[PDB]
Amino acid sequence: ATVNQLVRKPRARKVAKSNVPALEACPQKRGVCTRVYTRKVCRVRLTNGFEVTSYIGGEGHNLQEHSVILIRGGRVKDLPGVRYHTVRGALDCSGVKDRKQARSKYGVKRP
Amino acid sequence: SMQDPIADMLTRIRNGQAANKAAVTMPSSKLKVAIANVLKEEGFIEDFKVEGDTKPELELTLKYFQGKAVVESIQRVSRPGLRIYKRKDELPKVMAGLGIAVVSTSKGVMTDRAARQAGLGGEIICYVA
């Protein structure tokens, strides 16, 4: 239908924005875990300074306020503006101890 | 202003079959009497006549079978704003051969089966089922 108008102005397919709007086409990106407290979030300035919010899971609240961490993409569905998750088990990020189940989660070593 | 007399004839006979009328009159033309002749040859109507001299009138009577319309779906596939031309090898099979389609080809007016058996294609205009 309306083929004259369609050939005058072509049908433009709608763009699709990424759910992770910071450092796209990258699975894990680095950053400095500034403000590791309030209430379980870090304000992470990444390798280019996109300044995302990230959620910390498990133990390790004594992580350094200037600590190199890795960030993966994930929405928590419980807090506003939290669209990123800390990758527990990466470099300078102490894995959650006393968690012997879900080994791939938190980067815990088994005995 | 009317821009498609063939489509006007098709929608006239379609709503006439929907209303269960007896006969329908319309202005005439060469392609109109040709498509009426090939429709009668395919066997969807009984007959059609031409009345008058200065204004030719194609008076045609409709067909009904068991209290139902003989035709079910008539659709103009070659619109006057969107023409359709398909070659012989890609001629469609309306309802896998159960329906029919009119094709205006180089040897006059015929159907899809007649075009396949003659060996040439053209502007496929309407689907009748």
Binding site: - | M95, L98, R113, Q117
Partner: protein, 157 residues
């Protein structure tokens, strides 16, 4: 040799001055081994009672239609209450390719080679009514030859 396949169980709820009265509705289609299909929409306060009511309704309204060795005579388009379904014949080595409700109703009808796709809405009652109306509107070469006045050999070629 009839078959038994339920396709939809829902929990409706009405409101009364005392509170809420919950009820169970059951859509279930049945049919014979070839051609005759019928769907039933029962509603009660108990699940097996609603199932049996839907079964009796379907056995009452079991409609009849023909086919051609486990496939459609021609591609049909079933449109009803906002549900577009596309019934299309297939080759022998295909099987039954349809949705959930369409796959169930075609496996009940007993076809062997039918490809299909359900557009529009995804309501089970609407898609089963759409495919029933499509199968009912589907005609046969013998009846179209009797309606056009020609023979089956003239209509096949």
């Amino acid at each position: 040799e009839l078959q038994e396949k339920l396709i939809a169980v829902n929990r409706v709820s009405k409101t009364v001055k005392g509170g809420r009265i919950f009820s169970f509705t059951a859509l279930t289609v049945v049919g014979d081994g070839n051609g005759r299909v019928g769907f039933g929409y029962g509603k009660a306060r108990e699940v097996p009672a609603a199932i049996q009511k839907a079964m009796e309704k379907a056995r009452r309204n079991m409609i009849n239609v023909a086919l051609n060795n486990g496939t459609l005579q021609h591609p049909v388009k079933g449109v009803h209450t906002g549900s577009r379904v596309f019934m299309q014949p297939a080759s022998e080595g295909t099987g039954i390719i349809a949705g959930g409700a369409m796959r169930a109703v075609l496996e009940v009808a007993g076809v062997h080679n039918v490809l299909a796709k359900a557009y529009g809405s995804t309501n089970p009652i609407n898609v089963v009514r759409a495919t029933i109306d499509g199968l009912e509107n589907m005609n046969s070469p013998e009846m179209v030859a009797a309606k056009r006045g020609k023979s089956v050999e003239e209509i096949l070629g």
